Design a protein around this ligand. Sequence first.
Ligand SMILES: N#Cc1ccc(N(Cc2ccc(OS(N)(=O)=O)c(Br)c2)n2cnnc2)cc1
Ligand SMILES: [Zn+2]
Ligand SMILES: [Zn+2]
Length: 258
Amino acid sequence: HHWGYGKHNGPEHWHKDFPIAKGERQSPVDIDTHTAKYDPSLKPLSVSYDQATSLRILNNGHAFNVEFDDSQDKAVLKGGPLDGTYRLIQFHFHWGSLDGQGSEHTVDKKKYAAELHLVHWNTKYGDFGKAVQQPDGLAVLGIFLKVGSAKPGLQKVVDVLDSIKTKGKSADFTNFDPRGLLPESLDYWTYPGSLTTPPLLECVTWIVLKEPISVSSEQVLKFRKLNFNGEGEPEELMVDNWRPAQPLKNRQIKASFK
Ligand SMILES: N#Cc1ccc(N(Cc2ccc(OS(N)(=O)=O)c(Br)c2)n2cnnc2)cc1
Ligand SMILES: [Zn+2]
Ligand SMILES: [Zn+2]
């Protein structure tokens, strides 16, 4: 009746409504460090988030998202395997029902507690809507979350979740600096892929950081208090909103580090 993450409308069923689910460059994938290829031609990532302007945070029934004002050439991502400039539009997370799972990408089959996705679109296409129709339209920066010490820059996000528990709930969320969610190193793996949720379009250049950020057990626990349902409907906790690894096919994962 609509896609979701349940047993009867989850990832395994998506191909019926979106045939591209069985495509040639689907994401996420397992990053095999035995086969990842170091490429000396890969340039360092250039992240310019000082002018980032957050607007609001909302629960859309798939996860929670923080939206940014991508009107001006404010926060942009460039460098790395990218040609041109990509503007930050929003970020969201994927997590599990327990600390042992939750990430979309995996490294040598290892799953992390959660995964953060910072979504950017190629300015040469004018807007996000036109960018998703192009093979090089989007660039998503993926960051793994491991459980350990708390991440100070994430607390503002965690504390506001109590106010957007159900689908449709939103809350003003201005002055949030995404630089507080980045790890020390920007070394990365990159490969051509797709959106991990329907419509599953193959328009993404994936940039997955090698270094995960540490978040406390208390912080991740708050993620699991959200609901997939809207206020008034049967309670269904928002957990395990991740897609399993897909076939690598004829693709090569490149590493920016030796
Ligand atoms: N049709 C359609 C459609 C679906 C989702 C969006 N996203 C949110 C969004 C959600 C998932 C996503 O893919 S992912 N998991 O980051 O790989 C990406 Br990439 C972007 N969105 C919302 N506002 N800016 C982007 C936009 C259009
Ligand atoms: Zn080996
Ligand atoms: Zn995502």
